[PDB]
From a paper:
Contrasting with Enterobacteria, members of the dominant genus Bacteroides often encode several BtuB vitamin B12 outer membrane transporters together with a conserved array of surface-exposed B12-binding lipoproteins. Here we show that the BtuB transporters from Bacteroides thetaiotaomicron form stable, pedal bin-like complexes with surface-exposed BtuG lipoprotein lids, which bind B12 with high affinities. Closing of the BtuG lid following B12 capture causes destabilisation of the bound B12 by a conserved BtuB extracellular loop, causing translocation of the vitamin to BtuB and subsequent transport. We propose that TonB-dependent, lipoprotein-assisted small molecule uptake is a general feature of Bacteroides spp. that is important for the success of this genus in colonising the human gut.
Author numbering:
A (entry chain B): 21 to 355
B (entry chain A): 48 to 285, 288 to 331, 338 to 381, 406 to 700
Amino acid sequence: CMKWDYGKMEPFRATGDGLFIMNEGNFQYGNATLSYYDPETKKVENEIFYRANAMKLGDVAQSMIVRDTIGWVVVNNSHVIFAISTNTFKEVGRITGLTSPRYIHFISDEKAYITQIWDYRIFIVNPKTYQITGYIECPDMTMETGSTEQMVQYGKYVYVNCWSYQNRILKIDTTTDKVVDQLTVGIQPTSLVMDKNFKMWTITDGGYKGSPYGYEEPSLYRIDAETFKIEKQFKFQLGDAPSEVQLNGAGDELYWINKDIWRMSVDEERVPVRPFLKYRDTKYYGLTVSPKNGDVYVADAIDYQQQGMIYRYTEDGELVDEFYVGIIPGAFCWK
Amino acid sequence: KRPMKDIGVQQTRFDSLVLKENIALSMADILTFNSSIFVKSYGRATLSTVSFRGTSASHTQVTWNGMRINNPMLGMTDFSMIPSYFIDDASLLHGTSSVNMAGGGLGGLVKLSTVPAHQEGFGMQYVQGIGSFSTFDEFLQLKYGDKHWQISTRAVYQSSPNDYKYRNHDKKENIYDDKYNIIEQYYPIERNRSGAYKDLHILQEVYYNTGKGDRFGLNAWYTDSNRELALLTTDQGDDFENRQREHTLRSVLSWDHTRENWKVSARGGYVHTWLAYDYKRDATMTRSRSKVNTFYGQLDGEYFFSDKLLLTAGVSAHQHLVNSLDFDKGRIELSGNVSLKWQPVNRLGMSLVLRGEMFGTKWAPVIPAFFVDYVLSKRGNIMAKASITRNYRFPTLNDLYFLPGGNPALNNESGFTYETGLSFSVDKDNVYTLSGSASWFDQHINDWIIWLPTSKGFYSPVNLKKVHAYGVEVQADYAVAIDKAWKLGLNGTFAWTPSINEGEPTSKADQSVGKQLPYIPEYSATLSGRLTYRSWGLLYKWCYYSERYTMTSNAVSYTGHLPPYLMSNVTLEKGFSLRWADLSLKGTVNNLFDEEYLSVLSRPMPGINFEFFIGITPKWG
Ligand code: CNC
């Protein structure tokens, strides 16, 4: 008439240049999970972090950045960003005390700005000491609407889009650690990415019709790099909520969900009518493109209450592999 | 001595000593240990959800003094906000029996009432609860009666910082070095954060009797609560508060006019409910205000044609008004029922119940129900019974008018239920008293309301979700007198309740078909024991829940596993009779074996904890 459990570590060895599926998990349930898939042996390893550390990842596992041979794991709903070995999936350090981190970009081996939600300060941390250094003050920007997201380096400046309850792009100078420019874009820009033609690529979700901030037709934007200025705009009518823009290894073809995953080349002029994928019957959530071969991995959330799947297609559309991961897969990172 | 109203009905009743044993036990703690019901409750002073006979929370209708108490927006009630001493008589109606009194009770019905007192003169009671974790509980009682009046007043206050020591088997704290490297890992022992709470409950009762068959009453039940939301087990990092205040006033007026042959009852009531959500940290980060205005009315009749035949009629009407902001919606709820009970010979018994429901502007189909009872053998009171019905549950007010996702075109869920049971009652005079029952139930639910995402980008219920619920429920009560001063009582309940999702696969690859529903244990059993010797009292309570699945697919995962839940609570009571007062001393030990357990995913649990009560009942002239 008793109970037991506790965890037991097991050895892990990264045998190939695998892919890290960044499972978000539910929200206010603490069921975030991390997974590893090997594109060559066609074998997927789920719950790599729990089995290799005997302690759970957290809640709302957001994104992962791999630098050199170390991988940084962001847990949004636990104020913690990890640092794990990319070979044995073991913890070597952590950064805690954050407010609500989303994304991390390393300016150098010393400075790594961290984005947040529900806050207008961008954390500055030292990866080698796991200690908070300073904050970056975002103008006209408050806690009740706090939002920071994807950062893209361009020479000496970092561009970040303010997603949640925000409609502005911020350009940050790394040397002086202060914003220097701003552009006003549509409601709630989701993700920001960089191409070869030096044209900033992003989309704006309409967002939650009836929202206090407002409701609008989602759009797509292209922004010049050298001169921070809008260049071209696309409209995607009033339906659907686009998200998760991506590129390929060559940085010349654009991918985004908008129900029908759209595979369209860079420096085009119109949205192709045909869908790269038909948006069959489920609710896709994640998207990535291989930088070494060209495979397309599409993360399916199914019904948010069971294991999702990633569908692996080639650059032509040939089905290759369909494997299962944790609850609500949300992001990818390449080892 | 079967009551005619209780013909072919599977129900259980909680005795006085079951409800009046501790002042810290809400109805969540009562149902967990005293029945086979699954109660999803991750601790004390927390959101408790009841899943009954394999169904969801919304399929358990709750009525206090006749009027329905379920939240109009959600359709489900938090059983942890109802103190046990505020309930003087409670009953459970299983499945088809909920037709006799309520409407869309696909799972079952919980009926709560306060019997009038029988105390002459002035009296008082005061008990104080001194417990671990810096938890304090109080309960004050004031009563009076003069053969034509029964005035009562209760006030229950419970407060605690609610910060207990638990060991994290889901988090690990590291020991750094001189060069910010790693040295050793260890499972930390931390304290519950943001779990502080304080609750106030006041119940005022006025009962009037005329002595000519007319009885009057007025019950007012005011509730003030201020509970915070506990942090997750793996919630480390930082200047934080998150509270859910809740103000509720529930009033019921009653008048009963009995006669020599027939009886008519009329009741009316009013409920004001106000919820506030606050999320702030060092700033009005999030706000939410919910206001509910509710009016109630009911008229009931009951006529005897003879000792063998009985007819009843009843009309009810609820009116919910909601102005949730920080939008205007309402619904009238008529419910007429007619029942006829015929008892041809001493062994046979039939009962037919017809119900009519009209919620808002849509008419539900006629709700029939047949109850039959037969006596197999009077040697051991072997009695078998069977019932069958088709019941309908209307969509909740949220699913209809939820502004970004409301579809007022939903169809009410339908459920076909049939069950067969047996019972026995063999007792020996002042030696032993054994009774128990076993019933097999089978139910199919169609058009189960399931919120699902839409292509536009919002959520909307789409019915579907055929569900098959069936199983076996067993009850057993035992009492024995070992010696002239030792009395032993044993109460045991057992239930095997699968809940299979029979619906079509929503997508190409869903492992949910043919699987158990989330957070419903396949097996369940409870056992309670009581031994008393003179003024010494020892009580033992034990509950068992099988594995609970956290995913629809029932997939095996290391990070989503919930082991079978076995808990043991023991309490020793001693009573002292002084000259001017009576003192009752009891001490409660919860989590007796001190297992670092887990009943809800990634939510911390306390260890072994103690609770001490001091009870004073003055003895006047
Ligand atoms: C679909 C969804 C989700 N959402 Co919204 C997004 N994008 N959401 C929505 C959509 C509608 C939800 C709905 N109720 O119809 C959508 C896009 C409109 C929406 C909107 C919002 N969401 C927001 C955010 C950022 C979040 N959302 C997620 C919960 C993000 C979720 C990600 C995730 N991993 O869970 C999400 C993908 C899955 C929710 C779900 O269905 N869960 C399963 C469901 C069956 O269980 P559940 O727990 O009962 O789900 C309820 C809640 O999650 C609730 N909910 C949804 N969003 C929020 C936000 C908050 C603060 C709260 C308390 C509840 C919610 O929706 C469900 C009931 O419909 C989030 C984890 C996404 C992320 N990766 O950061 C994030 C929470 C961030 C954080 N650290 O707290 C918005 C501020 C964005 C915006 N401006 O549109 C806004 C919040 C509204 C508010 N209250 O102020």
